[PDB]
């Protein structure tokens, strides 16, 4: 979609609405509309707020779904 260099949709992931592409759950509330319409950061993906709070909002739960994946999705792809 946007900054997606070929991710997966198996584990904690989210299918970028409108595009066959699938953005990881960690990318959701990462703070950057990776999807075509920021669906990844939007609530449609499960950000529990969409934008509001950048990388959080409702509470720890928001980071619980994102952070938990920050050790693989973002800490294991093909950039570093
Ligand atoms: Ca993203």
Curated annotation (Swiss-Prot):
PTM comment, free text: Cleaved into a 85 kDa membrane-spanning subunit (LRP-85) and a 515 kDa large extracellular domain (LRP-515) that remains non-covalently associated. Gamma-secretase-dependent cleavage of LRP-85 releases the intracellular domain from the membrane.
Residue ranges of domain LDL-receptor class A in the record: 7-49
Residues carrying sugar: 50
Covalent S-S links between cysteines: 9-22, 16-35, 29-47
Tissue specificity comment: Most abundant in liver, brain and lung.
Intracellular or extracellular location(s): Golgi outpost; Cytoplasm, Cytoskeleton, Microtubule organizing center
General function of this protein: Endocytic receptor involved in endocytosis and in phagocytosis of apoptotic cells. Required for early embryonic development. Involved in cellular lipid homeostasis. Involved in the plasma clearance of chylomicron remnants and activated LRPAP1 (alpha 2-macroglobulin), as well as the local metabolism of complexes between plasminogen activators and their endogenous inhibitors. Acts as an LRPAP1 alpha-2-macroglobulin receptor. Acts as TAU/MAPT receptor and controls the endocytosis of TAU/MAPT as well as its subsequent spread. (Microbial infection) Functions as a receptor for Pseudomonas aeruginosa exotoxin A.
Summary of subunit composition and partner proteins: Heterodimer of an 85-kDa membrane-bound carboxyl subunit and a non-covalently attached 515-kDa N-terminal subunit. Intracellular domain interacts with MAFB. Found in a complex with PID1/PCLI1, LRP1 and CUBNI. Interacts with SNX17, PID1/PCLI1, PDGF and CUBN. The intracellular domain interacts with SHC1, GULP1 and DAB1. Can weakly interact (via NPXY motif) with DAB2 (via PID domain); the interaction is enhanced by tyrosine phosphorylation of the NPXY motif. Interacts with MDK; promotes neuronal survival. Interacts with LRPAP1; this interaction is followed by rapid internalization. (Microbial infection) Interacts with bacterial exotoxins.
Disorder cited: Keratosis pilaris atrophicans: A group of rare genodermatoses characterized by keratotic follicular papules, variable degrees of inflammation, and secondary atrophic scarring. Most cases are associated with an atopic diathesis and keratosis pilaris on the extensor extremities. KPA is comprised of three distinct clinical subtypes: keratosis pilaris atrophicans faciei, atrophoderma vermiculatum, and keratosis follicularis spinulosa decalvans. Affected individuals may present with features overlapping the 3 subtypes. Developmental dysplasia of the hip 3: An autosomal dominant form of congenital dysplasia of the hip, a common skeletal anomaly in which the normal seating of the femoral head in the acetabulum is disrupted. Its severity ranges from mild instability of the femoral head with slight capsular laxity, permitting minimal lateral displacement, through moderate lateral displacement of the femoral head, without loss of contact of the head with the acetabulum, up to complete dislocation of the femoral head from the acetabulum.
Family from the record: Belongs to the LDLR family.
Official protein name in the record: Prolow-density lipoprotein receptor-related protein 1
UniProt source species: Homo sapiens (Human)
Covered residues, full protein: 2770 to 2817 of 4544
